[PDB]
């Protein structure tokens, strides 16, 4: 049974609610982005209207085989009427095709559902500038002040400089980057651009990237692994055993691996600056954990909410424990007392 924080009151709508069977009263199912916890339950047998971005609809059609007649892609930054209700989709600064959804209810209430997002000051100049929001359904993944990490631009600078130094010292070093979902494509694309290489990957991963409307993508990726010195592998294979095994398969073309695991936050964030990050090494294999996040830090989240000044906040992450819920509610009240709304 569908939880309350996935339902939009005063509408026939749900958000990211495909694993509950036929939800009573739902006339339109919105999907914020193509991450498995959010699409869980969709397949070629689904026969209700799904509303989403163009990119998310390419993934639904090609990867999950949802039939075309049930996919309703909407343009971003554009007022659209869905089943009698005005909606807008906004870029969420999460993975490719991820959106926030603004709902203009028939009684005058305005609701923002962030989906998953990484808050940014650029959002203060979107269509959100123009009107009041009564209710905020908030991605609270890192809602505690211990969650700090650098900007995505600092992290990519570290990765490019690390990879270029290693491969210039040793032209026979291979770079490997871990992946298990869409998102974080700048990691491997920026490294391959500084090295003058295409990124090599499995046919299944190439297929996924071909759905993402990334400009000039045919110039940047390939299934011919032998032609490439940046390889993508499943995240589970980014360990010394898995990497040793991969190096065997390369036919003595390479004699060293430098590997990246883009995680979100790890508690090595509570002590170490990006500048000071060092790898784990065994023999001719080195593995870097880099803190590339596609969710808001605590400070980014607090700035966005203090700017928006919602009347009510509904968390959508960390809702299963009483300790999490009480922690989040305390911070919401601090923020409101500090800013004066
Ligand atoms: Ni996500």
XYZ file of C-alpha atoms and ligand atoms in Angstrom:
342
model
C 0.000 0.000 0.000
C 1.141 3.417 -1.184
C 2.525 5.699 1.518
C 1.036 9.164 2.119
C 4.210 11.069 1.127
C 3.788 9.681 -2.486
C 0.299 11.068 -2.909
C -0.592 14.636 -4.113
C -3.828 15.666 -2.252
C -6.578 17.276 -4.299
C -5.480 15.428 -7.356
C -5.590 12.043 -9.004
C -1.783 11.999 -8.936
C 1.009 9.926 -7.417
C 4.810 10.414 -7.592
C 7.325 7.486 -7.874
C 4.600 4.985 -6.892
C 4.801 1.972 -9.256
C 5.384 -0.940 -6.700
C 1.995 -0.806 -4.942
C -0.262 -2.278 -7.727
C -3.221 -0.228 -8.974
C -3.358 2.760 -6.578
C -7.007 3.635 -5.744
C -8.012 6.957 -7.298
C -4.835 7.436 -9.370
C -5.411 8.801 -12.880
C -1.781 9.769 -13.699
C 1.502 8.317 -12.321
C 4.428 10.761 -12.398
C 8.039 9.438 -12.488
C 10.735 11.968 -11.390
C 13.811 10.040 -12.721
C 15.127 6.696 -13.886
C 16.603 5.280 -10.607
C 15.456 1.779 -9.612
C 14.060 2.666 -6.099
C 11.744 5.176 -7.904
C 10.699 3.155 -11.013
C 10.301 -0.177 -9.003
C 7.326 -1.956 -10.590
C 7.197 -0.498 -14.086
C 7.421 -2.930 -17.110
C 5.951 -3.579 -20.665
C 2.653 -4.650 -19.042
C 2.007 -1.288 -17.344
C -1.191 0.288 -18.858
C -1.759 3.637 -17.014
C -0.532 7.139 -18.223
C 3.095 7.868 -17.034
C 4.174 11.479 -17.035
C 7.953 12.295 -17.108
C 10.759 14.047 -18.938
C 11.742 13.216 -22.573
C 14.952 11.496 -21.367
C 13.113 9.427 -18.738
C 10.583 8.442 -21.439
C 13.438 7.259 -23.797
C 14.677 4.984 -20.951
C 11.152 3.658 -20.161
C 10.578 2.722 -23.908
C 14.102 1.206 -24.577
C 15.168 -0.268 -21.266
C 11.934 -1.349 -19.533
C 9.824 -1.676 -22.882
C 6.928 0.304 -21.635
C 4.615 0.811 -24.616
C 4.710 4.147 -26.309
C 0.957 4.801 -26.026
C 1.308 5.071 -22.173
C 4.422 7.383 -22.155
C 3.644 11.083 -21.837
C 6.858 13.141 -22.047
C 6.643 16.859 -21.068
C 9.033 19.652 -21.960
C 10.837 21.426 -19.125
C 10.099 25.010 -17.924
C 6.686 24.977 -19.685
C 3.147 25.219 -18.163
C 1.199 22.017 -19.103
C -2.362 20.880 -18.220
C -2.604 17.260 -17.032
C -6.105 15.892 -16.244
C -7.321 19.372 -15.507
C -4.389 20.524 -13.322
C -1.524 22.927 -14.267
C 1.983 21.343 -13.803
C 5.572 22.418 -14.555
C 8.685 20.209 -14.760
C 12.009 21.786 -13.575
C 15.570 20.490 -13.858
C 16.500 18.712 -10.541
C 20.349 18.860 -10.979
C 20.364 15.049 -10.181
C 20.996 12.513 -13.037
C 20.049 12.934 -16.711
C 16.281 13.480 -17.135
C 15.611 14.078 -13.467
C 12.884 16.625 -12.630
C 11.142 18.471 -9.822
C 7.345 18.862 -10.287
C 5.279 22.060 -9.496
C 1.556 21.330 -9.031
C -0.959 24.242 -9.101
C -3.961 22.752 -7.264
C -7.504 23.669 -8.164
C -8.080 25.265 -4.689
C -5.025 27.711 -4.993
C -2.483 25.588 -3.068
C 0.947 25.266 -4.789
C 3.052 22.072 -4.130
C 6.743 21.506 -5.123
C 7.970 17.825 -5.210
C 11.743 17.878 -5.554
C 12.150 14.219 -6.515
C 15.844 13.606 -5.934
C 17.828 16.889 -6.336
C 21.094 18.732 -5.674
C 19.970 22.221 -4.677
C 21.686 25.093 -6.405
C 21.418 28.945 -6.314
C 20.453 28.807 -10.023
C 17.081 27.385 -8.934
C 16.355 30.786 -7.216
C 15.937 32.122 -10.818
C 13.793 29.437 -12.325
C 9.933 29.573 -12.533
C 10.021 29.139 -8.709
C 10.834 32.868 -8.286
C 7.323 33.899 -9.450
C 4.994 32.485 -6.732
C 4.458 31.150 -3.276
C 4.752 27.356 -2.333
C 2.552 26.000 0.435
C 3.913 22.412 0.619
C 7.487 21.077 -0.162
C 8.018 17.279 -0.660
C 11.799 17.350 0.042
C 14.766 15.018 -0.827
C 16.282 14.887 2.667
C 19.023 12.287 1.865
C 21.803 14.336 3.605
C 19.730 16.372 6.064
C 22.382 16.631 8.912
C 25.308 19.004 9.270
C 27.940 16.268 9.178
C 27.199 15.812 5.506
C 29.740 17.974 3.752
C 31.363 17.361 0.315
C 33.011 19.600 -2.366
C 31.431 21.041 -5.537
C 31.137 18.711 -8.511
C 33.621 21.056 -10.398
C 36.369 20.540 -7.645
C 35.856 16.785 -7.772
C 36.120 16.642 -11.596
C 39.288 18.860 -11.445
C 40.844 16.286 -9.032
C 39.876 13.306 -11.250
C 41.149 14.850 -14.553
C 44.493 15.970 -12.976
C 44.986 12.532 -11.289
C 44.252 10.534 -14.459
C 46.327 12.794 -16.776
C 49.331 12.644 -14.429
C 49.198 8.821 -14.107
C 48.823 8.033 -17.801
C 51.487 10.609 -18.887
C 53.918 8.938 -16.435
C 52.863 5.497 -17.741
C 51.261 5.288 -21.229
C 50.512 1.639 -20.500
C 48.116 2.453 -17.539
C 44.373 1.747 -17.996
C 41.742 3.913 -16.284
C 38.604 2.181 -14.963
C 35.426 3.947 -13.661
C 32.635 2.166 -11.714
C 28.879 2.629 -12.505
C 25.516 0.903 -11.469
C 22.905 3.435 -12.555
C 22.604 6.557 -14.693
C 24.122 9.688 -13.224
C 27.703 10.940 -12.660
C 28.580 10.597 -16.440
C 30.844 13.719 -16.165
C 33.396 11.567 -14.158
C 34.248 9.189 -17.076
C 33.522 11.726 -19.874
C 35.920 14.367 -18.423
C 38.713 11.794 -17.873
C 38.377 10.366 -21.455
C 38.381 13.943 -22.926
C 41.695 14.860 -21.171
C 43.271 11.541 -22.419
C 42.048 11.756 -25.991
C 40.131 8.506 -25.765
C 36.568 7.256 -26.163
C 34.993 5.494 -23.175
C 34.633 1.745 -23.614
C 31.706 -0.225 -22.100
C 29.267 -3.154 -22.420
C 26.527 -3.133 -25.017
C 23.864 -2.795 -22.195
C 25.567 0.382 -20.807
C 26.099 1.856 -24.310
C 22.321 1.364 -24.938
C 21.482 3.279 -21.727
C 23.806 6.203 -22.605
C 22.283 6.411 -26.090
C 18.894 7.393 -24.436
C 20.298 10.465 -22.614
C 20.419 13.296 -25.255
C 24.033 14.105 -24.466
C 25.518 16.282 -27.331
C 28.074 14.682 -29.606
C 27.787 11.348 -27.609
C 28.696 9.221 -30.679
C 32.106 11.033 -30.568
C 32.632 10.101 -26.853
C 31.613 6.434 -26.186
C 32.139 2.949 -27.760
C 31.617 -0.783 -27.370
C 35.079 -1.505 -28.805
C 37.001 -1.987 -25.595
C 40.361 -2.569 -27.393
C 40.294 0.897 -28.916
C 39.728 2.652 -25.518
C 41.932 3.428 -22.470
C 39.043 4.477 -20.201
C 36.775 1.463 -19.391
C 33.482 1.382 -17.516
C 32.704 -1.589 -15.282
C 29.981 -2.457 -12.828
C 30.527 -0.807 -9.353
C 30.699 -4.273 -7.728
C 33.780 -5.106 -9.799
C 35.747 -2.073 -8.422
C 37.942 -4.020 -5.975
C 41.399 -5.655 -6.220
C 40.079 -9.132 -7.304
C 37.736 -7.693 -9.892
C 40.333 -5.389 -11.354
C 43.059 -8.066 -11.510
C 40.652 -10.211 -13.477
C 39.854 -7.399 -15.881
C 43.588 -6.621 -16.486
C 44.110 -10.295 -17.505
C 41.443 -9.872 -20.210
C 43.241 -6.973 -21.881
C 45.888 -9.156 -23.592
C 49.022 -7.491 -22.133
C 48.154 -4.069 -23.541
C 48.268 -2.630 -20.017
C 50.441 -3.134 -16.928
C 48.729 -0.826 -14.348
C 45.096 0.175 -13.395
C 43.987 3.425 -11.935
C 40.253 3.075 -10.821
C 37.602 5.498 -9.601
C 34.523 4.787 -7.356
C 32.320 7.838 -7.318
C 30.389 7.382 -4.101
C 28.297 10.045 -2.405
C 29.419 10.909 1.126
C 31.683 8.598 3.158
C 32.974 9.528 6.730
C 36.433 10.114 5.217
C 34.592 13.472 4.314
C 34.548 14.473 8.032
C 38.412 14.667 8.068
C 39.984 14.894 4.591
C 39.990 17.706 1.983
C 39.565 16.709 -1.734
C 43.131 17.970 -2.328
C 44.442 15.453 0.241
C 42.529 12.305 -1.026
C 44.732 9.215 -1.525
C 43.967 5.779 -3.047
C 44.032 2.251 -1.713
C 46.827 0.389 -3.534
C 47.807 -3.278 -4.028
C 50.690 -3.901 -6.422
C 49.978 -2.242 -9.843
C 46.260 -1.449 -8.880
C 45.141 1.810 -7.215
C 41.455 2.706 -6.262
C 40.241 6.206 -5.503
C 36.927 6.918 -3.739
C 35.838 10.341 -4.906
C 32.908 12.215 -3.231
C 30.897 13.080 -6.366
C 27.304 13.769 -5.085
C 24.053 14.204 -7.014
C 22.177 15.120 -3.819
C 22.184 18.398 -1.830
C 24.730 18.825 0.970
C 23.243 20.011 4.261
C 24.208 23.610 3.585
C 22.819 23.577 -0.020
C 19.508 22.113 1.261
C 19.209 24.676 4.075
C 19.869 27.602 1.673
C 17.195 26.441 -0.772
C 14.539 25.904 1.861
C 15.298 29.249 3.673
C 14.917 30.954 0.220
C 11.665 29.120 -0.722
C 9.996 29.633 2.706
C 7.409 26.759 2.458
C 4.542 26.580 4.894
C 4.924 22.823 5.405
C 7.794 20.285 4.658
C 7.189 16.582 3.912
C 10.460 14.552 3.813
C 10.705 11.828 1.173
C 14.035 10.177 2.405
C 15.080 8.799 5.847
C 11.386 8.459 6.857
C 11.545 4.958 8.356
C 12.962 5.672 11.851
C 11.735 7.877 14.636
C 15.257 9.168 15.340
C 15.650 10.313 11.649
C 12.212 11.947 11.607
C 12.825 13.844 14.912
C 16.302 14.995 13.703
C 14.871 16.358 10.407
C 11.932 18.140 12.188
C 14.409 19.879 14.543
C 16.437 21.254 11.677
C 13.332 22.437 9.810
C 12.313 24.472 12.917
C 15.827 25.945 13.353
C 15.785 27.047 9.733
C 12.383 28.666 10.052
C 13.306 30.513 13.342
C 16.582 31.743 11.912
C 15.056 33.116 8.680
C 11.778 34.378 10.197
C 9.033 32.689 8.034
Ni 18.010 9.152 -7.520
